[PDB]
Nucleic acid binder design. Structure first.
Ligand code: BEF
Ligand SMILES: [Mg+2]
Lengths: 381, 402
RNA sequence: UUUUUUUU
C-alpha cells in the first residue's frame, strides 16, 4: 500500500528494499518492482474534470504521492470533492471502497444540497475529574446537538484552546460513533503538534505561515469531506480554531468590491465563510454535520466584532468565556448569561429544561465571577 | 593570504605591503593578481544562488549584497555539495582571466559531512523547553531590565517573541539589553542582529555594544535592500539550525520589514485596507522560521513590533503578527514619559506554555506576583516592581523573600 | 490605485 509505505520509516523500509532488490524515490522504486498494489486518499476534482487523491498527512496539499483520477471514474460513481477512495493503483487503476463502503451504494444517494435540514434533535451530552467541570457547565449553559452550528467566543489568553481540547476529549469519550476531525486555520506550529498528540481523530491544520489561499483551500477540503459523509448518513463533528482567522483569510482572498463594512471587512468577504460555517446542519434523511468554531472578541480589533456579530446571525449556539475570570485564574471561565442555545427545549427533557431555566434566572443577577464560583462549588458537591 | 582579510586591513598596511610585491579595491586586487603569478589565495562569504543557477559569495561588510569582491560559484559545486542559499563557504579562489576552485569548509564544517543533512523544512517544531535566563546577576543598572523580563515573559530556545510598544518606548534599548544578556549568559548561542530600515546611529552603536554579527540596513537604503538583507540573514540562520546550532535573531523591527515588502512586492490582485495581501505573507515566512527543533538545535527570533503610531498600516501589520508570536513583551509610553525604565507593561506581557521554561515553584511565585500587580496601574506596577527588586541583587534571593 | 467606503 502506498500510504502504509509512506508511514513506514526508512530504517525498516530499506531492509525490505534489500530483500526485494530519498524516501520518495526509494518508495517509488519498491512500488514499481511489485507491479511486475493499492493506495488511497481524498478526491479533489480539478478544472480539467480530472482528480487527485490528496493525502491527509500533507494536509490535503498538492503532493507528489497523489493518485491521478480519471474523469470517467468520476462519471461512473458520481464522485465529488471530499470523497474518500481506496483502490489498487501514480494512476488509479480500480476502486474498492468509496467513503468506507461499496462503490455501488455510493451511486444512489441524496445530494447534500437536497438533504432536508432540521434543528438539532439528538443531544451530544458532554468521571468526576476536574476537567469535567468545563464539560458539565457546558451542558447547563448551552446544549449541543447533532448538526449544531455553535461558536466558542472568548478574549485571547482566556482558554479557547483548553475548551476545544476538552470538548474533543469528551466527544471521543461519549460519542466514538461520531466522526471527529479537528481543523486548525492560521494556527501556531507549536500548538498544532500538541493538538495531534492528545486528540483522538484526524487533525487537519494550516500554520500561520501559510498563505491565505492555503487556509481557504484546506478549510474547503475538510468541509466538503464532511458533506460526503453526511450523504452516507454519518454524524460528523468539526472543531475549528478559529472561524475568525478563517474569515480574515477569506477577506484577504475575496476580490475588492469597492465597498468596505465597518471594521475593515470587505462587503463580499463574509459570504464564503458563511457557507463553510453554514454547512453544519441536522438532516432527517440520516446523519448530521456539527461545527464548533471559536470566535475572537474583546481583542482590540473592530474587525473581529463585525465577524462575530455576523456569524451569530448564522449560528444557533454560543458559549462565552470571560477574561475577568481568566484573570481570577478560576476555571471554567464561562459567562453564563451571554451563553445560550437556540431551540434548546428539543435537546433537553422537560424536567431538565425546567431545572436549567430556573437556574439561569438565579445566575442572571449574579456577577460573572460569583456566578461561576457558585456553579463550580455546586458541581463539586 | 586572504581576500576578506586583505580588504579588512587598512590602506596604509595595504599599500606598503603592495610596494614589496590607486583605489583600495584595486590595491587588494593588484596584490592578489601578483600573488597568483608568484605561484601562491583564499576567500570566503555567504552563498546566494541566483535564478540563473549560479551563485556568488556575498560579503558581510557589503551586508550580503553584490560586490566587486564576490566569488563566483559554478553550478557544479551546488550539485556536488547540494548547496542552498545561506551556506557559508571558505576555500581557495583565483582572479578572473573572482572564481572558486575548491571549498575547504561549508558552514564551518567539513564539506563531506555537510553534503548529507536533514532539511530545515523537515525539522519538527515544538514548544520552547530550554530556558534562557536574561538576568546577568552583575548587579548592574541594566540588569533591572533583564530581571523584570525574566519575571514577566520568559524566553527559551526556538522562542518566537515580539517587543510591542509605541515609538520612543524603549524597544531598541530592550534588544540592546537582550544581546548583552545573550552574550553574557549564553555565549554558546549564535547571535545575529538584524536592523531593518532604522536610524544610522543605531546600527553603529549596535555594532560597538554587543559582540556578534550585526547585519543592518539603515533608512538611507531602498526598500528592495531591506528585503534582500533579511532574506540572506534568515536563510543563513536556517542553514546553521540544520547543523543543530542554537540560533538567535534579534530583529528591529518587524513592522519596518513588513513595510519594505509591501513596497517591493508586485501589486497584488487585491489591496487590503493600505497593505497588500501577498505582501504580508513574506514577513510571516521570515518570522515563522522561529521554532524549537526536536531533532536538534533551535531558531529564536525576538523582533520589535510598533503600535500606537497613528498609522493604520502599522496596526494591520501588528494584527497579523499579534497571535503569531508565543512570547510578548509590551512597553508603555506613559511609563516612558515618566522616565521610569524599563517601561514594561507587566500585565500584557507573558509567554505561552511558560510552565516548560520555569520550575514549578518559580511558575507559582510568578503567578502570585502577577496577581498582586494585576490591580495596579501600569506606572504603579513598574515602580512597585523595580522597588522590590532594588532590595535584591538576583531574582532568586527576591523569590525566597516571598 | 486617489476621492467615496474604511472613519470616528
Ligand atoms: F521610534 Be522607535 F524606535 F519605535
Ligand atoms: Mg527603535
Amino acid at each position: 500500500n502506498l500510504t502504509e509505505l509512506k508511514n513506514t520509516p526508512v530504517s525498516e523500509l530499506i531492509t525490505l528494499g534489500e530483500n526485494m532488490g530519498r524516501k520518495q524515490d526509494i518508495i517509488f522504486a519498491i512500488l514499481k518492482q511489485h507491479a511486475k498494489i493499492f493506495g488511497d486518499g481524498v478526491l479533489e476534482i480539478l478544472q480539467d474534470g480530472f482528480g487527485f487523491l490528496r493525502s491527509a498527512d500533507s494536509s490535503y496539499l498538492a503532493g507528489p504521492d497523489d493518485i491521478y483520477v480519471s474523469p470517467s471514474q468520476i462519471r461512473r460513481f458520481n464522485l465529488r470533492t471530499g470523497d474518500t477512495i481506496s483502490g489498487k493503483i501514480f494512476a488509479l487503476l480500480k476502486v474498492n471502497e468509496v467513503n468506507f463502503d461499496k462503490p455501488e451504494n455510493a451511486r444512489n444517494k441524496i445530494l447534500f444540497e437536497n438533504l432536508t435540514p432540521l434543528h438539532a434533535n439528538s443531544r451530544l451530552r458532554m468521571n468526576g475529574s476536574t476537567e469535567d467541570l468545563t464539560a458539565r457547565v457546558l451542558d447547563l449553559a448551552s446544549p449541543i446537538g447533532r448538526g449544531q452550528r455553535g461558536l466558542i467566543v472568548a478574549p485571547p489568553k482566556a482558554g479557547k484552546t483548553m475548551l476545544l481540547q476538552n470538548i474533543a476529549q469528551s466527544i471521543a469519550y461519549n460519542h466514538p460513533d461520531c466522526v471527529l476531525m479537528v481543523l486548525l486555520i492560521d494556527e501556531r506550529p507549536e500548538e498544532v503538534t500538541e493538538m495531534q498528540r492528545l486528540v483522538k481523530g484526524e487533525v487537519v491544520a494550516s500554520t500561520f505561515d501559510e498563505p491565505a489561499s492555503r487556509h481557504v483551500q484546506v478549510a474547503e477540503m475538510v468541509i466538503e469531506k464532511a458533506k460526503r459523509l453526511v450523504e452516507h448518513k454519518k454524524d460528523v463533528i468539526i472543531l475549528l480554531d478559529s472561524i475568525t482567522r478563517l474569515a480574515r483569510a477569506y477577506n484577504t482572498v475575496v476580490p475588492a468590491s469597492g465597498k468596505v463594512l465597518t471594521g475593515g471587512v470587505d462587503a463580499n468577504a463574509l459570504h464564503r465563510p458563511k457557507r463553510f460555517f453554514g454547512a453544519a446542519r441536522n438532516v432527517e434523511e440520516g446523519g448530521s454535520l456539527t461545527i464548533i468554531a471559536t470566535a475572537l472578541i474583546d481583542t482590540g480589533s473592530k474587525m473581529d466584532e463585525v465577524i462575530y456579530e455576523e456569524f451569530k446571525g448564522t449560528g444557533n449556539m454560543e458559549l462565552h468565556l470571560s477574561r475577568k475570570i481568566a484573570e481570577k485564574r478560576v476555571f471554567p471561565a464561562i459567562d453564563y448569561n451571554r451563553s445560550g442555545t437556540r431551540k434548546e427545549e428539543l435537546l433537553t427533557t422537560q424536567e431538565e429544561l425546567q431545572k436549567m431555566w430556573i437556574l439561569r434566572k438565579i445566575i442572571h443577577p449574579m456577577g460573572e465571577i460569583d456566578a461561576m464560583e457558585f456553579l463550580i462549588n455546586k458541581l463539586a458537591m
